[PDB]
Design a protein around this ligand. Sequence first.
Ligand SMILES: [Mg+2]
Ligand SMILES: [Zn+2]
Lengths: 54, 1316, 288, 251, 66
Amino acid sequence: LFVEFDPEVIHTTTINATRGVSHFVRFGASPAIVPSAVIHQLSVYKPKDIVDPA
Amino acid sequence: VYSYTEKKRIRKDFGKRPQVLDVPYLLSIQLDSFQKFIEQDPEGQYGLEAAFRSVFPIQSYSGNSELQYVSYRLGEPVFDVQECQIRGVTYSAPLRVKLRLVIYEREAPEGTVKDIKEQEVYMGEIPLMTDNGTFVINGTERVIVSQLHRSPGVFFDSDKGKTHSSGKVLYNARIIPYRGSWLDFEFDPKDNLFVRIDRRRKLPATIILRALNYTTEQILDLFFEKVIFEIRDNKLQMELVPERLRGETASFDIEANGKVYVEKGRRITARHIRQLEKDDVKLIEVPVEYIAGKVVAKDYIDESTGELICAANMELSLDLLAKLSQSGHKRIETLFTNDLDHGPYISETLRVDPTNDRLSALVEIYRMMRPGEPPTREAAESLFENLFFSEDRYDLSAVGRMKFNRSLLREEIEGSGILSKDDIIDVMKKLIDIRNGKGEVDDIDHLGNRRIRSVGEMAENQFRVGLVRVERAVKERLSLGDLDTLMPQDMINAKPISAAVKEFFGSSQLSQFMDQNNPLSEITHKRRISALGPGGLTRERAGFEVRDVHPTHYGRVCPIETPEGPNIGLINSLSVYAQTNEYGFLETPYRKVTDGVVTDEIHYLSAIEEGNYVIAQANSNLDEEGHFVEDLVTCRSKGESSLFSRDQVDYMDVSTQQVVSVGASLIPFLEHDDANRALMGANMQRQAVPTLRADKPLVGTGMERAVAVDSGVTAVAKRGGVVQYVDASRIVIKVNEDEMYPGEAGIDIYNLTKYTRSNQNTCINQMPCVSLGEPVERGDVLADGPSTDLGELALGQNMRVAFMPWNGYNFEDSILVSERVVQEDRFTTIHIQELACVSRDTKLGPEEITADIPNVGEAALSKLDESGIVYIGAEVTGGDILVGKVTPKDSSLRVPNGVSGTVIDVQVFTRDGVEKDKRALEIEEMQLKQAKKDLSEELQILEAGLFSRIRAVLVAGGVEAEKLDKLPRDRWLELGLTDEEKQNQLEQLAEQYDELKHEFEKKLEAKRRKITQGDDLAPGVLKIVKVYLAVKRRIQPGDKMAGRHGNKGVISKINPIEDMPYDENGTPVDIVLNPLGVPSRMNIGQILETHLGMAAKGIGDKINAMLKQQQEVAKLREFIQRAYDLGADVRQKVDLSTFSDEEVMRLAENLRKGMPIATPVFDGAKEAEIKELLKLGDLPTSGQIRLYDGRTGEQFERPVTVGYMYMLKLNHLVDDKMHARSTGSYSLVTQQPLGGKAQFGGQRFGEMEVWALEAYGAAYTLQEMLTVKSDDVNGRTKMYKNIVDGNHQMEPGMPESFNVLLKEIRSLGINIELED
Amino acid sequence: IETPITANFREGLNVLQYFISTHGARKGLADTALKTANSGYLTRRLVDVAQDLVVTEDDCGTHEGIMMTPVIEGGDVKEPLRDRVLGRVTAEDVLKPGTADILVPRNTLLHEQWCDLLEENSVDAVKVRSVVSCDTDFGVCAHCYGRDLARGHIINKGEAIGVIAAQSIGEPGTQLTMRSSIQVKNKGSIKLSNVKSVVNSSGKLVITSRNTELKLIDEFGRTKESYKVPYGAVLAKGDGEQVAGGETVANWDPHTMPVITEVSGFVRFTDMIDGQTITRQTDELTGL
Amino acid sequence: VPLDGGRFATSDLNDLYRRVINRNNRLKRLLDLAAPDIIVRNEKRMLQEAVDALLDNGRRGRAITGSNKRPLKSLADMIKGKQGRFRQNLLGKRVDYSGRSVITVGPYLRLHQCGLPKKMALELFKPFIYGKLELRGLATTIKAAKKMVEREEAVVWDILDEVIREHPVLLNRAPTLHRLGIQAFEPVLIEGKAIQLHPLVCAAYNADFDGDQMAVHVPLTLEAQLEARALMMSTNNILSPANGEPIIVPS
Amino acid sequence: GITKASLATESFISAASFQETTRVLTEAAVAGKRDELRGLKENVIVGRLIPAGTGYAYHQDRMRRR
DNA sequence: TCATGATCATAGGCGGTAGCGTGCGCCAGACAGGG
DNA sequence: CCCTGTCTGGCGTCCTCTCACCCCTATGATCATGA
Ligand SMILES: [Mg+2]
Ligand SMILES: [Zn+2]
C-alpha cells in the first residue's frame, strides 16, 4: 500500500501501534524510495480480468 | 516443665552448649514472600500495588482520555483445596480491580473532565498459596523455588589474563539494572575506553558524555587536574606541586631560591618533595622541550583573527606556543598524564572520537541501536531519554540503588530508580581509579552480590509483563472509539494477564513438581536456592567457580547438602537459621559480644556486614558469665580463619547447628563423617519412602520435632483443651475456657486425611495418636502423619546390625537381611497407583462404558458390576478389567501387566448433559449422604458445645438444679434470670444458634448443588473414571536400603532365621553389613551411631526387664533417673519427682522398645559418654559381642561389632526397574522398537556397545544386533518364523532407517544413490 | 590454609574444620563431573579417528623400526627395557657385544624368555618394528603390531586394533586429573653427548654448549642417569672418567648466561661507540 | 502425532512446508495479476527466506519459532548432531529380545555363568519356547502356545530349562568404557527379580552393587551363539587389552 | 590432529558420522565423491558385516570374487 | 413483528502505535583493518 | 600484500526412571426476549 508521510521528525515506533505496518519496500537495508508508477504514468488499470482469483 | 506429649517419651539429650535462639519456622521464605506479594499494602511498595501503580494510569495517544487506578480486592475461591485436588481445577482466587475512566476536554488538559466512571473489573486468576507453602496448579501440588541471581547495581569485574595473550588485564564495569538496558564500560589493549549497550556494537565511551551535554572543556575539567604555566619574563615558568613528581626523572636541573634542588638524570625523592613544600616553592623554570608533549585542556581563540589557536585536548608544539604567546595569553592550562598515576585514557578516547557536539553523539547512539535508518534530532532525543532516563523503560529497584550507592562510597542509600549524569561519571571515575592501581575489583560468588528472589517477586514480575501487554492493548483501544459510551470492562481483557501468570505457575524452569514422599523431602524442597532458571546460568555451559563453596556461605547456604551429578553447587539448599534480608540478601543471627561478656541478644548480619567485624566460632568454651576461658580463640576476620585474642571479638555464633541445613542436621555424628559421605547421606535421607509402621530414631539430633511440626503432615492443635472423641476419621477437641472466645461457642473438629495418593505414589496417611479424655496444649501434635511417630520424624526403621564379612553375599556394598525382618512386616511399604479412563467422542458415535461387552465371558465380567466399573474392594491381578469400554471394538481399561492391588477408591466425573448411569448415581447418593451426615454432625457437635456453654453459664445466678432438664433443651433462655451479662450471653448464643440454622440450610443447598452439578472437562469427553489401586510392596532381593551416612546397598539375600550369627544370649542379628566400606569410604560416624544405638537398646532392655517382672514404680523411678542424668554439664536436667507415679509407668511403656537419644550435630556425645552409657546397661565396654555362627554353630574368632543402626528403605525398588522384551510394538517414523518401560520397549544398544563389539571379532552378533533384531521389518518376520521353526538363520536385508537417511538427504538438493 | 586441621575423624571436628573439609570435597566432586564430560568425548574422537585400521596382512617386508630405550627422566629408571620391548618383532637382529655373534634373529617375537635373556646380557637398545613405520597399503601387517594383547600368541589376521587401541587410551581418562647443579646417586662411567668443551685456567673442563647431555653409563652397558646440561656450565669432571656417588660434578648460574671464550688474549671493543652503542650507567652503591 | 485431545501438535517439518507453500501460492498469484513495477521483489525475498528456514533453520539470521522461544527443527537439524539420524538411529539402535534389571552378588556361581530371573528368562526367550512347544506337540497352533505361556502352566518351566541350557546371553553395563564391558554368560534361573552376577567379573565392569543396573541381550542366530561362546565368554577375557595384567584380580 | 585427520577422509560417511555434517556433505556433494564402504563404520551404518572379525573372512571372499 | 443483546462456537503466528536480549568457553579458519 | 584483529562457525558423556505440558481470546452469527 502507498502511503505519504515524512520520516525523521515523526519517528516510527510511536506510530507502530497501528496497522499499515509490515515494513518498507527495501531491496536493501534502507527504506527504499519507491516509484509511484501507477500514480504518475499508470493511473487506471485491471483489464487483466475480474477472474476473482480461483 | 514439659508439655504433655513431652511426658510421653522424653528424648535423652546430650549436648553441652546452652541454646539461646530456637529453630525458626522452617517455611518462612515461601509464606513470608507470598504474604508480602498479596496483601493490601499502602505507601506504594511492595506487592501488587507496585505493578498497579507503575503501569497505571494509562494515558491515550493525545485523545485526552485516561484509565487510572483505585484499588484491588480478591474474592474467595470457589473451590477449597480438597475439592480442587479431587476435581483438577487451579486453586485460584479472582482478582477484582476498581478501575476509573476520566475523559478531558479540548484546549485544557489542565481542565475539568466532563464525566468519570469508576467500576469493578475482572482480570486474571492468581493462584493462592496453601498453608503448607505450596500451589495447586492442575490438581498436582507444585512448589515455586527461590532463585539466586546477580544483585542489581554497579559491578567492577576484571577480565584477567586471558585476553590479548600478553598478560595485560582488562577492567569492565557492568551496570546491572533491575529492568532495562545494560551498560558495559571496558578497556582495550590500546588503553582506550569503550562503552557498549546490551552487548551490541562498541563505541568510545566519551560519546555518551557528549550525549549528557558536556563540552570537551568540561570533560577535561572533570577527569583530570590542571597544570598552570605562567609566562613571566623567563622561559615560561611553571606552578609546581611536587606530589606529581613522586619518582619522575627530570630532564634538567630543577633549582629555586638560588639553590639546586633536583639534578638532571636523577628523580625527585620524597624528602626533596618535603624540601620544596617546606620552602613553599611555587614558580619553577622549564625548558622549551618540557611542553613538547603537554596536552592542553580548553580551547584558546585569537582575539584578532577570530580563529582557533589550538583545539581542546591537543599536545603543544613550538609553533602553537609561538601563536598563543603573541596573542596575549599568559596562563596555560595543561593536564598531568603520568605512567603510574594518571594515564590519558580519557584523552586517547577523545582522540578516537569523530563526534564534536551533542547532536552527532545522539545520532551515533541512535545508529548503533537501530542500524541503517535516517536519524532525526527528535528521535535521537526520545531514544536516549528512554534508554536510561525514563521511569518506564529503566528502573533500578531499591536493591539496585543501595548497591549503586554503596559500591561508589555514597552516603544516602535512597535515590531515584533512574540514572543521572553523576552516576555514569562516578562509574567512569571508579573504573579509572581501579585501572590506576588503587582500590580493588569485585568477585562474583561473594554472597553480598547474590540476591534471592522468591515466589512473590517473580509472580509480581510476570504479572507486570502481563500488564505491559495489556497497556499495549488499552493504548490501542482508548483513543480509537466513541466516548462517552463505554465502560472499563469492554476495554481491558483478562486473556494476557491470566495467560502470563498461568504460564509462569504452569510451566517455568522454577515452578517445579513437588518431590513429596516424606515430610523431610517437602520441607527441604521448599527451602531451595536454585541458581538456574531465567536470569541465571545454565548447566551445560557454566562452569567452575560457581560450583564451588565461597568462604561466605558460612551460615547462609548449606555446604554439604547439594545434589551430586551434573548440577553440584547450583541447586544449593538454604541453611537452618538463615533468614532473608529486607532487600533480598541473606542474613544470619549472631550474638553481640560486648567487650567482655557474650550478651544474649541476637543480631542479624548480612553478607557484607560480616566481613568488617570479627566473629567467634560457635563452640568456644565460656564459664557461666560469657568470659572466654581461653586467651586465644579461633575466629574468622575477613573470609579467612585465624586465631585471635580474647576481647577483640565482636560476635559469636548462636548455635552450632547453623552451618548445615535441615536435610543434613538429622544425621547424628555428622562431625565424624567425611563430607562426600555426608552429602550422599543427606541426599538419600531425602529419597526415603514411608514404611507401614514407622518406628523412631534411637539416635537422633533433637531436630526431628522441628521438621515434623513445622511441616504440614501432622495435625497440630490450634487451641488446647480436652479431647472428646477420637476416631480413625476425625478428632474432636473441647477448647479450654482460658483460651476460648466468648461467642461462637467452639469445639474444634479435625478431619484427618486418610489413605490418598501422594505425588510419588506413596501413601500419605494420618493416624490419631491421642487417647480419649487426654489434655492437649496449644502447639501440639494430635495426629501423626506419614513417617512420623508421636510428633517426631521416623523415616526408616532401626534394626540390629553386625559388621562382619559373611560368605561373600555382601561383597561390594550389598546388604544381607534375615527373614525375621520380612516376617515382622516392617519394611512393607504401601503404594497407590491412579489409573484413568476417559470416554471420548469420536465418529460413528460416542463410546460405551456399560458391561454388555463383546469377546468376553463370565471369568472377566465376574469382577465388574452391572455398569462396567470394578467394585470398591475387589482384589485384582495384573491384566484384569477395571473399566469396560467399547467403541463403535474392545478398548477396556486393564491393569498394566505386572501389578496386583486392591481397588480402594473410584471417582466418576460426568460432563454436564450426559446421562448418568446407575453407578454414577450411586456415587452421587453416597457423597450426598456423606456430606449430609457431615454437616448435620457439624451442627450437632457445635450445638452440643453451645448447650455445654449454656450449662456452664447457668451454674450461678438463678440456677435450677432440677428444673433444667424437665423442658426440651432448645429453650434454655427464658428461665428466671435478670438483665445481666448472662442473659446478654444467652442472647448472643441465640444469635449464634439461629446463624447456624440458616447457615446449615444454605450450605446444605450449596453442597447439593456442588455434588449434583457437572464439571467442565476436556473438548469432547463424556465421563472420566479414575480407579485407585493400592499395591503393598514388601521387600525382596534387589531393593535399595541405606543408612544415614552414605552406606548404600542392594540387599542381596534374604536368609532364614537360623543362619544368622547369634550371640551367647540367643538373639539373632537382623542385618549383616560389610566392614570393608569403612576405611576407604571414610564414614566413621556409622560405627559411633551403632555403639550408641546398642547403648540405647541396652537401657531399653533393662527397662523391659524391670517392668516385665511386675515391679513397683520406685525401682523404675530409680533406674530412669540414673539413665537420664548420666553425663557432663548437659542441657536436659530432668527429674522424675514431678511425674506422680502414673506418667512414669506410661513413660516406661514408651521406653521399653528402646530409649531415644538426641545427639546434636557438632556438639554431640563424645566417646567417654557412650562408654559410660554402655556401662549403665550390662553390655561390654568396647561395644563388641562375641558372636556364634548359625551354620556351623561354632564361634567367630575376634569378637564382632553389633548394635542398632537406623536404616532407610529407598524408593528405587527392583520391581520398578526390571523389564524384558521379546517382540513388542515398533515406532512409526523409524521402524525401531519404542523406548521406556511403560511403553513396552527394548534397551538401547548404544554407540559405545557397537564399539565394544567391533573391538572383539564379533561380526554376526553385531549384524543381527542392528539389522535383524532392530530395524529390518521383512528381516525380523523371517527371523520370527525361523526361530519358531528351529532354524537359527537370518536373512539380512537393509535397515529401514538408512532408507530414512536417504530420504532426508535426498529431500535436499543432494542426490544420494546406491551404485551398481 | 596456614592453620591446619588438627583433628581426626575418630575425635570430633568443630565447625570451621568441617567447613574447610567441605571446600576440598565439593572441589573434588565438580572435578569428577566435568572430567567425565571431557573423557567421553576424548574416547569418541579417538575411536572415530582410528575406526578403520584392520590387521590385513601377515608380513609387510621392511626393516626400519623405532628404537626402544628405557626412559630416563634423571632419577631412577622409570620404565625398564623388559616392560617396553615385551612382545614386539625386532627390526635389526640384536648382536650381543661379542660383535659378529647373533643373539636373536631379525623376526623373533620377544616373549618372556627372550626378555629375560635380554635382561641378562644387558642389551642396550633392541631396535624393534613399530606400527607407525609399516608398509602395508590400506591397513597394518601382523608382524609390525606385536603380541595380541589380552592373549599370548601373535596377533590374528583380522582383529580391529584401532578400536581396541582407542578404547585403551581413552578408558583411563576418568582417572586422570583436570585442573642449580647436577647431583648423582649411582656410580659408573661418565658419558657426554653433543658437547663443545674446552679447558679453563683452573684445570677443569668448561662447556661452550647448551645442547650438552650428561649420562651415567653403568657397569654392564646401559644408562641409569641423564642430565640436561645448560650453556656454559662448568664440570668438575670430563668425558669417559669415573665418579662416586653423592658427588656434584657440575655447577653453573641459572641467572647469568656465560659468554666464556676459547682462546687466551686481550679484550678490545669492536663497533662499540659510547653514547649510542653502550651507555654510561655507574653502579651507585657498589662501585664496580 | 495425535496427543489424544482432539488436536494435532504438529511436527516442525509440516509447519515449514506449509509456510513455503503459502508464500509460493501468494507469489504465483502476485505474478499472475501483475506486480506493481518495483514491487515483485519483497515476496521473492520472503520466499527465499522461508526456503532458507526449511533447509537449514538458524544459519541465516534470527531463526523462527512455533512455541515459544525454542527454534523449530529444519532438515539439517534432523541430519546433524545428536538427536539426528546418524548418532541416534543408525549407529546405535533400540533392540528387541533385551531386558534390564538391578544387579546383585550371589557368590555360588562359576565364573562363566550368571543368575537371571525366571520372569526375564521367560520373556526374553519366548519364540524358542513356542518352537519347542509345537515341536514336542503340546499346542497345535501358535495361539494355544501363546496362551499356555501367558498362563505359565507347569510344563513350560521344563521347556525353559531345556532352552536355556547351552545358550549364552550378553550382559552389558550401561557406561561401556572398554571392550570388557560386554561379556557373555550362560544363565541360571533364579527365583527373584535381580541378576546375580559373579563377583570377580565385577572388576572389569567397574561395578559395585549400590544400585547398579545391567542389561541382558540374547543372541538369536547360530553364528552369534558361537561368537558369544568362543570370542566373548567370561572365561576367555582374563587379560586386559591395555597391558598384560590379569583382570580377574580378587577384589 | 585427530579431529581434522578424521574429517579429512576419502569416505564421506565416516566424516559425516563424526563432526559437522553440513560441511562434509556439501564438499562431497559438489565433488561427486564416491564412498565404497571402506572399513568398519560405513558397514555399521549400511547394515552388513564388519570387515574385522568373521566378516573379514567374508570380505576376503567377496573381494576375491570381484 | 422487529430490533437488540447475550451466549456459544469457530477461527490464526513478537504485540505494539517499543523493546525484549545481558551468568560459557576454546579452537580455528576466513574476512577484513592497519600499515 | 603482509600481518593482526575480529567474527562467526563448530564442538561440549552414557544409560535409565519419574512428572507436567501441548492455545485462549475475539468476532460473528443465531436465538430469544422485550417492546
Ligand atoms: Mg556405585
Ligand atoms: Zn609392517
